[PDB]
Design a protein around this ligand. Sequence first.
Ligand code: ATP
Ligand code: ATP
Ligand code: MG
Ligand code: MG
Lengths: 148, 174, 172
Amino acid sequence: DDARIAAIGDVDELNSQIGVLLAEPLPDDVRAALSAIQHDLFDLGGELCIPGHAAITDAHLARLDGWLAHYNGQLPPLEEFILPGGARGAALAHVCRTVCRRAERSIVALGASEPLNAAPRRYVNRLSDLLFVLARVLNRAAGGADVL
Amino acid sequence: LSKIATRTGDDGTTGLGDGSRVRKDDARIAAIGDVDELNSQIGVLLAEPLPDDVRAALSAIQHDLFDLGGELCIPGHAAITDAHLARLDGWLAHYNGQLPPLEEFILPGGARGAALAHVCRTVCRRAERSIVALGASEPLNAAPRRYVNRLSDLLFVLARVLNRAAGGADVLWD
Amino acid sequence: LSKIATRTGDDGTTGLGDGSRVRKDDARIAAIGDVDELNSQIGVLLAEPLPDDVRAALSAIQHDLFDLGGELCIPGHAAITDAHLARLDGWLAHYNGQLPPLEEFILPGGARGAALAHVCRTVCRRAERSIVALGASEPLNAAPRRYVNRLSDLLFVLARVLNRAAGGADVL
Ligand SMILES: Nc1ncnc2c1ncn2[C@@H]1O[C@H](COP(=O)(O)OP(=O)(O)OP(=O)(O)O)[C@@H](O)[C@H]1O
Ligand SMILES: Nc1ncnc2c1ncn2[C@@H]1O[C@H](COP(=O)(O)OP(=O)(O)OP(=O)(O)O)[C@@H](O)[C@H]1O
Ligand SMILES: [Mg+2]
Ligand SMILES: [Mg+2]
């Protein structure tokens, strides 16, 4: 039906939102991670599209896990629920976060109607969490703080 | 086969505030998501220069949206009340009263802030559709629906307010 | 009983231009919404500095999209014609002949304007899916789908044009 084409489109939309975030000033490390993720998302979309073709591996998941641990250990503990916003960069990261979750919903729907490896949903599951973390990093880097 | 440790929702499911689990493509999770996406777009608008009063209203709205999402997360919970709807209706009367009557149809755009407000407006209307869809398959309070109904209207109004504030005007349709 | 007055759309239903009403999650309302969201994203791109011709094309497109939303609101009515499709084809030829042959795959991004154009492109394809879905349940003129299909291609080309105009470059 529409499941595959919809999932591909949402991943594309997410990747485009990340492109907008990349047009902003960013810490060099954050920029490097986001740029690499764009390539990952391009490959992810290809896996969703072509039958019998896989591209996302444990290595991709491991790298995301590594970035999560890294950036989180670079931030103070969460003291309260956060509202999406702050420096423009942080706000955009939150938009990316929500679009990534939207793509995850579509990927989950796709896997329910067609055989699909688990890597794609596990990738965006981690990515959503990382974008949340990166938003906090960007507020920090802007000399500001998260919106509570 | 995978050597990577499993994370909470790696299996495509997630939990609700009452302890129940649902698949991530569930209508309720979709509505929660659209509300979150709307709140995030408002965060982008808040990152722009804005009149103090407009910033105050939008900031308060983010809190409302956080609670609305929380209500969608905890089935049977009620965080959105008449007070919330009354405040939106008040802001609507407040800003509309200071603007000239809407003449021709307008196109979404203008000053960057007004343009962003229009994006917020459309994402808000998208959230309204998913909230309406959730309510058609699950008993839900009407407040959430009524709240976003008013919010898209207010976002439209605030877009006009922002074009004026920038010293410009609304983009008119041919 | 709520102490707040009710709006006509508070019950979750809304009206169509033909006097009928449907629930807001109806396929037709979803398509109207996505076209509106796309037009709004184009509004954000129009707030960026742009080459004069690109601004003229995008501004005209906003009027087309408003018309398209109007056609979707009035079931059966026809507002978008081949004339609109032809203009898009014209712009596609014009801007493509303004760019070097694309050799490698492109990632969405670059100068802010180009990045926004790609966001517009993805939202446009989302509206196309909604319009296509509407056709699965109701008879629908072909112009609306043909228009957004062409527009998604045009937005891709305009993104490339904007990267060059901003002294930037496409992300390979
Ligand atoms: N893809 C999604 N779209 C919208 N809302 C979501 C999505 N995934 C989770 N949520 C909601 O957000 C809350 C927490 O998000 P989180 O991503 O931590 O959940 P999870 O994916 O189940 O856990 P984990 O990240 O540890 O795998 C949950 O209460 C859930 O209702
Ligand atoms: N959530 C939505 N998404 C997309 N289109 C909508 C939505 N709600 C209404 N529309 C369409 O847009 C037009 C005007 O929107 P409006 O919000 O004024 O309608 P309503 O919600 O029925 O009325 P009210 O706002 O007074 O309750 C209507 O003709 C309707 O077809
Ligand atoms: Mg998760
Ligand atoms: Mg309404």
